[PDB]
Design a protein around this ligand. Sequence first.
Ligand SMILES: CC/C=C\C/C=C\C/C=C\C/C=C\C/C=C\CCCC(=O)OC[C@H](CO[C@@H]1O[C@H](CO[C@H]2O[C@H](CO)[C@H](O)[C@H](O)[C@H]2O)[C@H](O)[C@H](O)[C@H]1O)OC(=O)C/C=C\C/C=C\C/C=C\C/C=C\C/C=C\CC
Ligand SMILES: CC/C=C\C/C=C\C/C=C\C/C=C\C/C=C\CCCC(=O)OC[C@H](CO[C@@H]1O[C@H](CO[C@H]2O[C@H](CO)[C@H](O)[C@H](O)[C@H]2O)[C@H](O)[C@H](O)[C@H]1O)OC(=O)C/C=C\C/C=C\C/C=C\C/C=C\C/C=C\CC
Ligand code: CLA
Ligand code: CLA
Ligand SMILES: CC(=O)O[C@H]1CC(C)(C)C(=C=C/C(C)=C/C=C/C=C/C=C(C)/C=C2C=C(/C=C/[C@@]34O[C@]3(C)C[C@@H](O)CC4(C)C)C(=O)O/2)[C@](C)(O)C1
Ligand SMILES: CC(=O)O[C@H]1CC(C)(C)C(=C=C/C(C)=C/C=C/C=C/C=C(C)/C=C2C=C(/C=C/[C@@]34O[C@]3(C)C[C@@H](O)CC4(C)C)C(=O)O/2)[C@](C)(O)C1
Ligand SMILES: CC(=O)O[C@H]1CC(C)(C)C(=C=C/C(C)=C/C=C/C=C/C=C(C)/C=C2C=C(/C=C/[C@@]34O[C@]3(C)C[C@@H](O)CC4(C)C)C(=O)O/2)[C@](C)(O)C1
Ligand SMILES: CC(=O)O[C@H]1CC(C)(C)C(=C=C/C(C)=C/C=C/C=C/C=C(C)/C=C2C=C(/C=C/[C@@]34O[C@]3(C)C[C@@H](O)CC4(C)C)C(=O)O/2)[C@](C)(O)C1
Ligand SMILES: CC(=O)O[C@H]1CC(C)(C)C(=C=C/C(C)=C/C=C/C=C/C=C(C)/C=C2C=C(/C=C/[C@@]34O[C@]3(C)C[C@@H](O)CC4(C)C)C(=O)O/2)[C@](C)(O)C1
Ligand SMILES: CC(=O)O[C@H]1CC(C)(C)C(=C=C/C(C)=C/C=C/C=C/C=C(C)/C=C2C=C(/C=C/[C@@]34O[C@]3(C)C[C@@H](O)CC4(C)C)C(=O)O/2)[C@](C)(O)C1
Ligand SMILES: CC(=O)O[C@H]1CC(C)(C)C(=C=C/C(C)=C/C=C/C=C/C=C(C)/C=C2C=C(/C=C/[C@@]34O[C@]3(C)C[C@@H](O)CC4(C)C)C(=O)O/2)[C@](C)(O)C1
Ligand SMILES: CC(=O)O[C@H]1CC(C)(C)C(=C=C/C(C)=C/C=C/C=C/C=C(C)/C=C2C=C(/C=C/[C@@]34O[C@]3(C)C[C@@H](O)CC4(C)C)C(=O)O/2)[C@](C)(O)C1
Ligand SMILES: [Cl-]
Ligand SMILES: [Cl-]
Ligand SMILES: [Cl-]
Ligand SMILES: [Cl-]
Ligand SMILES: [K+]
Ligand SMILES: [K+]
Lengths: 151, 151
Amino acid sequence: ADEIGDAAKKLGDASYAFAKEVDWNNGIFLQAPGKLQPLEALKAIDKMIVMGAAADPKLLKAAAEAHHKAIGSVSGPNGVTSRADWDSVNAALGRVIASVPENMVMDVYDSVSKITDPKVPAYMKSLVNGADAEKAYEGFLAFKDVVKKSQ
Amino acid sequence: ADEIGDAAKKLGDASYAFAKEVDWNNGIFLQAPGKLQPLEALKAIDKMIVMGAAADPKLLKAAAEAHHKAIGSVSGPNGVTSRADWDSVNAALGRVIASVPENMVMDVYDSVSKITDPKVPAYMKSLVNGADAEKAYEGFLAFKDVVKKSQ
Ligand SMILES: CC/C=C\C/C=C\C/C=C\C/C=C\C/C=C\CCCC(=O)OC[C@H](CO[C@@H]1O[C@H](CO[C@H]2O[C@H](CO)[C@H](O)[C@H](O)[C@H]2O)[C@H](O)[C@H](O)[C@H]1O)OC(=O)C/C=C\C/C=C\C/C=C\C/C=C\C/C=C\CC
Ligand SMILES: CC/C=C\C/C=C\C/C=C\C/C=C\C/C=C\CCCC(=O)OC[C@H](CO[C@@H]1O[C@H](CO[C@H]2O[C@H](CO)[C@H](O)[C@H](O)[C@H]2O)[C@H](O)[C@H](O)[C@H]1O)OC(=O)C/C=C\C/C=C\C/C=C\C/C=C\C/C=C\CC
Ligand code: CLA
Ligand code: CLA
Ligand SMILES: CC(=O)O[C@H]1CC(C)(C)C(=C=C/C(C)=C/C=C/C=C/C=C(C)/C=C2C=C(/C=C/[C@@]34O[C@]3(C)C[C@@H](O)CC4(C)C)C(=O)O/2)[C@](C)(O)C1
Ligand SMILES: CC(=O)O[C@H]1CC(C)(C)C(=C=C/C(C)=C/C=C/C=C/C=C(C)/C=C2C=C(/C=C/[C@@]34O[C@]3(C)C[C@@H](O)CC4(C)C)C(=O)O/2)[C@](C)(O)C1
Ligand SMILES: CC(=O)O[C@H]1CC(C)(C)C(=C=C/C(C)=C/C=C/C=C/C=C(C)/C=C2C=C(/C=C/[C@@]34O[C@]3(C)C[C@@H](O)CC4(C)C)C(=O)O/2)[C@](C)(O)C1
Ligand SMILES: CC(=O)O[C@H]1CC(C)(C)C(=C=C/C(C)=C/C=C/C=C/C=C(C)/C=C2C=C(/C=C/[C@@]34O[C@]3(C)C[C@@H](O)CC4(C)C)C(=O)O/2)[C@](C)(O)C1
Ligand SMILES: CC(=O)O[C@H]1CC(C)(C)C(=C=C/C(C)=C/C=C/C=C/C=C(C)/C=C2C=C(/C=C/[C@@]34O[C@]3(C)C[C@@H](O)CC4(C)C)C(=O)O/2)[C@](C)(O)C1
Ligand SMILES: CC(=O)O[C@H]1CC(C)(C)C(=C=C/C(C)=C/C=C/C=C/C=C(C)/C=C2C=C(/C=C/[C@@]34O[C@]3(C)C[C@@H](O)CC4(C)C)C(=O)O/2)[C@](C)(O)C1
Ligand SMILES: CC(=O)O[C@H]1CC(C)(C)C(=C=C/C(C)=C/C=C/C=C/C=C(C)/C=C2C=C(/C=C/[C@@]34O[C@]3(C)C[C@@H](O)CC4(C)C)C(=O)O/2)[C@](C)(O)C1
Ligand SMILES: CC(=O)O[C@H]1CC(C)(C)C(=C=C/C(C)=C/C=C/C=C/C=C(C)/C=C2C=C(/C=C/[C@@]34O[C@]3(C)C[C@@H](O)CC4(C)C)C(=O)O/2)[C@](C)(O)C1
Ligand SMILES: [Cl-]
Ligand SMILES: [Cl-]
Ligand SMILES: [Cl-]
Ligand SMILES: [Cl-]
Ligand SMILES: [K+]
Ligand SMILES: [K+]
């Protein structure tokens, strides 16, 4: 047990209602988040690849395992994993994030932002309950504070 | 040095002409290989996630590093990495493939085949020199024989 795991349970309390509202089977998630821009997108993928190579390989393995288990508990009309598996994925990802330097994480974020059209967040939010999305994000903010402490 | 590395150099002799002909900046590679089928695609991703969790985490790290370096040597009008980085990526991937049971690898292959429209290979081949694609594939066949010996 660790503090990221405890923070993941609070994150689940804040964010699972939102996860149940997302239609995970919508094909839109395969499309670029705006205009397809291969050269800029490759720069973002490169920052991810750098981060993945730097991450604790054991924590990467555990995060992959948590997603395998999560796939197994998918149910209902939107393809949402169970509450327990949601929390397990989020904890495992938090551990991976904490295992690399903050710069690496910020470089992925900035590089993905560069290819994301300004309308995409509002469009995604419009498909779910906006107050639940807001609660989920406020949950994320608290969670990342715990992740940073462990980083 | 190892036998996968030696086999990767022979693979490069057979396949680099083909890699130079592919337009790596074509946006088509973001689309599903046929009809977008989220439920079946998730099954294929699940088999990949199982395989990634089983792979030697050190060899996964080295494969990610080889791709970072490869991105750095991209040049020319098609976005092709250097010959040396092509071989380095292929060796590193061969090591990852050899680090898991053959079943896991075949399960990814079969699961991806299930979502790949029968026209996709011929369409991809039609964009390059068909004899160079054939040489590349004959190269792959020899390479995977070395990978299997190490597996
Ligand atoms: C063949 C290739 C195969 C596959 C292709 C590969 C990849 C697909 C590539 C791209 C598709 C992926 C993602 C893009 C898709 C979807 C995008 C998903 C992300 C999103 O929607 O983000 C919304 C967010 C909104 O802005 C925030 O608003 C805040 C408001 O806060 C106030 O009010 C609150 C309540 O309202 C609270 O009360 C608070 O207390 C109060 O403070 C503050 O103003 C913040 O400063 C401000 O940041 O926007 C941004 O962060 C920047 C945009 C994009 C970054 C993009 C993404 C995140 C970055 C990195 C994630 C890492 C990786 C993503 C990718 C993959 C995951 C591994
Ligand atoms: C939001 C989500 C984000 C991203 C989405 C994520 C993923 C994208 C998902 C999918 C897109 C990916 C791929 C699909 C895209 C493109 C497809 C790329 C693959 C392709 O084109 O394959 C062509 C191949 C042709 O068939 C072979 O013909 C042979 C002929 O051999 C003779 O003649 C020869 C010379 O002519 C020689 O002389 C020889 O000596 C002589 O023997 C034999 O008959 C073989 O028995 C027969 O197998 O087809 C198949 O293998 C099955 C089809 C698809 C499997 C699909 C893929 C491979 C499987 C696994 C690869 C693993 C993973 C792929 C994916 C990713 C890689 C990590
Ligand atoms: C089928 C399998 C699968 C699927 C469908 C996904 C889907 C996703 N992954 Mg995951 N992932 C997988 C397997 C999968 N992954 C595997 C095998 C691994 C390796 C172990 C990872 C490792 C991984 C990492 C390291 C990250 C992702 C992230 C993401 C998201 C990227 C787009 C995004 O930011 O949306 C928005 C995100 C969500 C809807 C997820 C919930 C986010 C918080 C907790 C609550 C919602 C807040 C707010 C409303 C929206 C996000 C704002 C943002 C600024 C934080 C998306 C939800 C990224 C992510 O979520 O970035 C924010 C991310 O950082 N994945
Ligand atoms: C921007 C980065 C990037 C890009 C663009 C790609 C692109 C690709 N990856 Mg790679 N990968 C990356 C980073 C990247 N990867 C990273 C960071 C990792 C983790 C370390 C991986 C790990 C990985 C694995 C484990 C595998 C791939 C494979 C593939 C291919 C999947 C589609 C396919 O089969 O086409 C066809 C494939 C090619 C054109 C590549 C050359 C294949 C041989 C050597 C020669 C050509 C033979 C023939 C003409 C066509 C293929 C037939 C097939 C049955 C073998 C595609 C070329 C897969 C692959 O190639 O499956 C066959 C695969 O198994 N990737
Ligand atoms: C081979 C392999 O290993 O694959 C595995 C690799 C990983 C990394 C482990 C993995 C993973 C995670 C991944 C990739 C997550 C990707 C998330 C992508 C989210 C994409 C979104 C939100 C895309 C869009 C596009 C939109 C477009 C919206 C608009 O155009 C619309 C409609 C109308 C316009 O007028 C205005 C507009 C508003 C602009 C939008 O609003 O949102 C996975 C899944 O496991 C696969
Ligand atoms: C060996 C191997 O194969 O590894 C493979 C392993 C994987 C995992 C499969 C893999 C991969 C994918 C990877 C690495 C993904 C990385 C994801 C990173 C996500 C980062 C995020 C969300 C960062 C942020 C930063 C934010 C900042 C927000 C703020 O600053 C803002 C705006 C304003 C401030 O006032 C408040 C604030 C809140 C502070 C935010 O909101 O979010 C890959 C590439 O395939 C390689
Ligand atoms: C088709 C289908 O059915 O697909 C199904 C597939 C599944 C897998 C079964 C499934 C599922 C679950 C999924 C996708 C869950 C996704 C979870 C994503 C979690 C992401 C996390 C936590 C990312 C971060 C990034 C962080 C960054 C933190 C920092 O940068 C910040 C901000 C500020 C810096 O100063 C300090 C910092 C600390 C560096 C962080 O702390 O965390 C589902 C829903 O069922 C759908
Ligand atoms: C080849 C093939 O077929 O592969 C298949 C493989 C798969 C895995 C099966 C597959 C899949 C599924 C995938 C990747 C799913 C990814 C899902 C990502 C969902 C992202 C969502 C919901 C994003 C958001 C962002 C929002 C932002 C909200 C806010 O920021 C806003 C506006 C304003 C702020 O003030 C407050 C805020 C509230 C913070 C929100 O509310 O939501 C797919 C697509 O089928 C393809
Ligand atoms: C977030 C993160 O970590 O992301 C990283 C995760 C990884 C795994 C490390 C990673 C990787 C590798 C990946 C995903 C490779 C994906 C390869 C995909 C190849 C897709 C292809 C060939 C798609 C098509 C679609 C086609 C459609 C053709 C047709 O429709 C057409 C035109 C006309 C129709 O009439 C007939 C038709 C013929 C049917 C086609 O012919 O081919 C990467 C890139 O690093 C990102
Ligand atoms: C911890 C963590 O995060 O790990 C992350 C790590 C990654 C790597 C980023 C990641 C990923 C992606 C993964 C695993 C991809 C796996 C790719 C597997 C590719 C398999 C291939 C091509 C298999 C085959 C089999 C073939 C067979 C051909 C033949 O049988 C045929 C027809 C006919 C016979 O007569 C001749 C023959 C020739 C014998 C073939 O031709 O090809 C993921 C999911 O993101 C998780
Ligand atoms: C936009 C842009 O510019 O992107 C740029 C991004 C880069 C990275 C810089 C770049 C590059 C390079 C790239 C993509 C290289 C891709 C290489 C893929 C290699 C895949 C390999 C080897 C896969 C396998 C699968 C195998 C399976 C073997 C077996 O199953 C087989 C058959 C039969 C079983 O009985 C035994 C077995 C042994 C189990 C194997 O042995 O090997 C480029 C080109 O510049 C484009
Ligand atoms: C959000 C966002 O923007 O992300 C961006 C991220 C990136 C990384 C920048 C990105 C990218 C690039 C990517 C994934 C590139 C992947 C490329 C895959 C290429 C696959 C090719 C060539 C496949 C083939 C198959 C062929 C088959 C030939 C044969 O089988 C045939 C018919 C018949 C047999 O008898 C003989 C044979 C000869 C064996 C062939 O000849 O070729 C992208 C797309 O821009 C999206
Ligand atoms: Cl929807
Ligand atoms: Cl571009
Ligand atoms: Cl082309
Ligand atoms: Cl389906
Ligand atoms: K561009
Ligand atoms: K289906």
